[PDB]
Design a binder for these strands. Sequence first.
RNA 1: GCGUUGGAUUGUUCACCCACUAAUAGGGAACGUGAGCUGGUAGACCGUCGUGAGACAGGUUAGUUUUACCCUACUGAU
RNA 2: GUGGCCCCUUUAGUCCCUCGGAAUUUGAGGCUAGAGGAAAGUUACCACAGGGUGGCUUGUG
RNA 3: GUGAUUUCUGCCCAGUGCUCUGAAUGUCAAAGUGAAGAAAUUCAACCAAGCGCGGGUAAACGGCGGGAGUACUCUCUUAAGGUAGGGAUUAACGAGAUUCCCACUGUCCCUAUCUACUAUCUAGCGAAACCACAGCCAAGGGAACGGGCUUGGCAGAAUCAGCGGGGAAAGACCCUGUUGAGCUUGACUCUAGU
RNA 4: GUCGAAUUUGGGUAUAGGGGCGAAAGACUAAUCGAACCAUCUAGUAGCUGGUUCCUGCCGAAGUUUCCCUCAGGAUAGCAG
Lengths: 196, 130, 120, 139, 431
Amino acid sequence: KQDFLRKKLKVGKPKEKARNATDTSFVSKTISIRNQHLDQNPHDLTKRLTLLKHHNINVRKETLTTFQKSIPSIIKSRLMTPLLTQSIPLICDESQQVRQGLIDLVDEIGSHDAEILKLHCNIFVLYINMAMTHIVTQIQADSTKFLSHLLKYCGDEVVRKSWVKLLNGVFGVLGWNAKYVTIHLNALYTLVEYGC
Amino acid sequence: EMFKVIKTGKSRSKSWKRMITKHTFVGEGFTRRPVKMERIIRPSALRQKKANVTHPELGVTVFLPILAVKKNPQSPMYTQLGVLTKGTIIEVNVSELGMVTAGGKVVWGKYAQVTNEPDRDGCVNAVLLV
Amino acid sequence: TGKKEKSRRIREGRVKGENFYRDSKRVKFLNMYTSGKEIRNKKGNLIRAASFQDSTIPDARVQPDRRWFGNTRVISQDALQHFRSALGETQKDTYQVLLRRNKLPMSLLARILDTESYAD
Amino acid sequence: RIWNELYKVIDSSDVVIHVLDARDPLGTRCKSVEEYMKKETPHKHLIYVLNKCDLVPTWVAAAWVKHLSKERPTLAFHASITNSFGKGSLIQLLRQFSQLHTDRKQISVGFIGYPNTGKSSIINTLRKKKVCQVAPIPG
Amino acid sequence: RAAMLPTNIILLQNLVKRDPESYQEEFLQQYAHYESLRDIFMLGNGSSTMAGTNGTTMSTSTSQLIELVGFVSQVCSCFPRETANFPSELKQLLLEHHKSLPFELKEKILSCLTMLRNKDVITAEELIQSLFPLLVAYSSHGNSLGVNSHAKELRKIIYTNLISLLKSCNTNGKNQKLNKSTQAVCFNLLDQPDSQGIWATKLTRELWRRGIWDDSRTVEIMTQAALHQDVKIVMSGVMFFLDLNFSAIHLLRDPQGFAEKLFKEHLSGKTKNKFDMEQKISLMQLLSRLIGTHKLIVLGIYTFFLKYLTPKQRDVTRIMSACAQACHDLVPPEVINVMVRKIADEFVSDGVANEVAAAGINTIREICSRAPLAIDEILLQDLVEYKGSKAKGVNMAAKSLIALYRDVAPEMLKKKDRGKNAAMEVQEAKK
RNA sequence: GCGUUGGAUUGUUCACCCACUAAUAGGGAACGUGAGCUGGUAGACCGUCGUGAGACAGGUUAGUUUUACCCUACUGAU
RNA sequence: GUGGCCCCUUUAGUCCCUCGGAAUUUGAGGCUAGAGGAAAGUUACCACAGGGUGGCUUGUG
RNA sequence: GUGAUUUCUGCCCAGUGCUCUGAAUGUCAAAGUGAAGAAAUUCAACCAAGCGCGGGUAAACGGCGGGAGUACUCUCUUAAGGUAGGGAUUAACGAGAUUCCCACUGUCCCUAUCUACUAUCUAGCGAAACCACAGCCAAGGGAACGGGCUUGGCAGAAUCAGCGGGGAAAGACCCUGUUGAGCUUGACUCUAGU
RNA sequence: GUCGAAUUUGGGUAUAGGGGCGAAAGACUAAUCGAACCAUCUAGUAGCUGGUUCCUGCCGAAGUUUCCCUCAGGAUAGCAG
Ligand SMILES: Nc1nc2c(ncn2[C@@H]2O[C@H](COP(=O)(O)OP(=O)(O)OP(=O)(O)O)[C@@H](O)[C@H]2O)c(=O)[nH]1
Ligand SMILES: [Mg+2]
């Protein structure tokens, strides 16, 4: 318990700094804030793109409605294929409201630009035949609406690629109740038509 | 005579808390501890930053900022608490005096010994150790 | 049998109150809230004073040393001025922040009455 | 009595948030405390939080945040247990300060400002339940 | 409960494990969903870019596949039909994409393969061909530099899973067919000179420590690693042969040539100057501890030490403690005399400090304990000068040298030091 | 010797504010342990802590001692 | 000149004692000589039994 | 467990618990098996569950970030993002806690008056608490404090109605038992049940 | 405060003490409840308090001196008969 002391001479190690040498070395980190996006920018829909994954349901519905309204000014741009990539998996969504909003969006984008549907037809049919085999019946029922609205616009390359997956998925979901059966039967009519 | 007992609770039955009655030096980045975790209380009024240091030569005194407490002769716990009792030895800045060693290195810290009991006087008066 | 402090200490590898919970270090901390207390006998008189209340007047000496009277804190002019410049740059910017701030030296940062005397 | 609590809170705090009303921040600023924190306590951080941003348009909030980010970080905020704004940004900033103060073992954040600015509501928003009493009356 | 049963897997599997003749349709209702899910997976904060993610939120498709994989892997043994291609689907899901799968799904498949191998559905000979190629791929430096690639965690998972596999296989009897096969891949990794033998060395050390790979074939792998060009592989080999050394030295094929090749390649030959001092010292330790133990002769060691035998040098107490460890009864004492006269000139000279002199004498007497006739009486006397030295380091040191030569060559000492029995033994034996 | 006020303020008052006034002086006899009348344990909630029972750095709320007819003193009365 | 300056573990017994109806052989106990060295908190929901001026000050660091 | 409706409901199975018809190996009781010995006995092997090990679960207790390159250090993502600038202007009920306004008044300045039953006096009836002895003051000693002691001021019967200063003259709080009980917990020893 | 109902109530009946019942206050369970009441074991017991009955004569004290895991109930030196 001394007021002054040495460790030791400590042969082999670096010598030491004596007792009073001042050390003028430091480091200064710089704080980083979020941006918070308070000022309108042209790149604003690119931020609403990812709200299709929002845990809330009204958020996703209103986002799909906004993208529906903003179609003609973005139909030819760098945002449409990511829009469809991020919105197609809502076929297996838990809400009739969101599925209906997506039906409306695909109708609008089909009336405007159908080459994008022709380009994205594969993941479309994959998610449709996933919904056809979904253990949830709310999702298993609303498959054929997406299918019919798809055939309405692209129609024949979908069957030129995948015919049997479609047919066996429909015959599965049919079980082979009031209006879902009618929708399945209309889809069957349109499918067999595009098979002619 | 140094620590006062402080009691906590509605029915005050727990004491466990100790207030230092005398003047103190805490440092530059003090930042009080939470109440559930603080035991030693060093109140803001009994907290000194500057002393009144006299050079025995030159017949001159200066109001210098304190840098540290190295040795309070009573129970070196008190050194870590930073208690400025009589006879306490402190490091004070001396850059105002323009002292320089052989080599041209400016001196900015020196030892001083307090000569008063600042629990009785708000002043902390000290003498430089040349 | 498995729920015994003996078996626990065996399978893993002293103070009153060491359990599956509350190791050595924790028991001492939690005893702080209680036993800042004053011990007495049955008739009433102090055996053991409360903590930080020992009540003994120590021998308060300070020995001579050649290490007093010496320069304890030294700095060269070039390092000093560079240190001034960098921190004058740093501490004007509020988004910046120094990391340690305690190991660092921050301390390094006519009159006519002589002629006329109120009376002339 | 109140200013004793103020200085107690500051001395116990490692960070000080300064809550302003977006209707009148310069009215609700309290510059003397910032000057005291400059001279006395440079080791504290002293950031701004605009609150009640839901009452004013977005461009006014952006303007004030731009005007005040020149000097102090200045987050914008809206306090509600249900529908909030700025919660994650403030969380991120506080854990930044925590990462800087890695040796202290804990970091205390005081809430300073005028009455009726939303300090209790900001705390209740961070915790996401009613922790502090709240009322439209000031005190 | 009925409508929720398809959503609750934990109850479904406990029901299926009881009566699996029932719950066939319940299993097909989920296998179809799993098929449709895998058929899919087969194929910033700036004002402009899309917002990023935190790293812990996932997709509802992935959250379903992660559950279905476990269900199917736990009831495949009850439904051998309709599941025969399931592990092959997992394998070609892993080792043909590597990147379009999230980390949680990869981890889940990696654990389901391990339990499918614990059960005898899958064999080690085809699980190894799944696990090893992913190590090299996630140690790529191009796969590990995405945004949220979990490359380090995956490289740890695959490594500990391989360890569990081989520990599993070597319990009853040592599966030589497996060990001899997965040592060949270590050999064929150490050939690739970039860094890929890391996953051979780090693994062989673990298996040696677990006692699973006590064999002559394995020590050759670490020999080749020590003889390698990459620093972190050479160090793995050296630290293996260190851990005072371990029993692996008693399974070497030629320790003398090993030490010769080491001293020639790394330290002296090209003087490439790749190793830092902290690694050079660990190489010196290995060389000296092999040499002293097995009676080797190199003779270049003893001039290589002399550059570093100076008290103004970085951490010399380790170097001089290995100097003694390379001394024998069977080497020419002149090449050690030069060493002792360097130490004596530079450590027990005029003006030197107490610790310095004590270190010198202590590292000389433990040399002379192995090579007694390596310093002569004239300097022995100069060093036993320091007996009564008042410092308590040099005295304790000199007494050790005196007690060392009191039992070995007491005639070199003077009459003052021969302690009551050496002198009596000399008086009878001098006539 | 004689007087030395009326009020506002409990997000509080170990005090201050504006008026009137000739003036708006300071104190004691209680507070040198504890003594008229009035504001400022049991139940419950939030916060900190605790594995927990519970405790508190806190905060809020509600919440039953009841003389004199005895001696003395004092005030009046035979 | 007969040196120096200040209490629970274990082993062994020639021809040691005993195992009580006699003996032998294993074990056990002695007496010898050796070598080693049971247990945490809380209670304001509580209860019981006890206990508890040196004439001091004033305006001037 | 939460506590109408409405609105919101993001992430973590590192930890502690719970759970899994979860391989082998490890730990591993009794019975049973083998070896030695003349035998009592000694040793070894085998050895269920449980543990350990690794999978699931957070409207379970906890808890609050992720990844990569060489615990540290650099880097960049942070999806508890307000869906919109219409984002919060938000019932009824209550012997619940609180502030302000109108009205109204003896709450107050500033007290006065009246009625009934008492008190009061009388006939009859007739207790209780408390009680070492008793009962005028001042100063001193004194445990800060005398009705009794010392020194002084004084002191005249027996008494009625009132008063509440004192005496009546009958509290909390603090501490201690190696106490009594209640409660809790991987504190110790046990135990029903399984 | 409430007053047509989760309403108020009589009689009969069921639940019994480490047990019951509880729209939960540790509330109620015959003026008794953080474990009812009666008798016995039982003159239960610590610790501490209170008290302990006739006269005279003669002698006549004591307070760290040394220790058992610190208080502690003690064991002892010395003093007196
Ligand atoms: N619209 C809106 N109102 C807010 C916001 N924050 C607070 N308020 C409202 O402001 C009122 C008063 O502010 P407080 O929450 O009490 O803020 P405070 O005065 O600092 O709180 P205290 O510390 O308790 O005094 C509250 O009753 C809220 O209703 C906000 O972000 N937006
Ligand atoms: Mg307020």
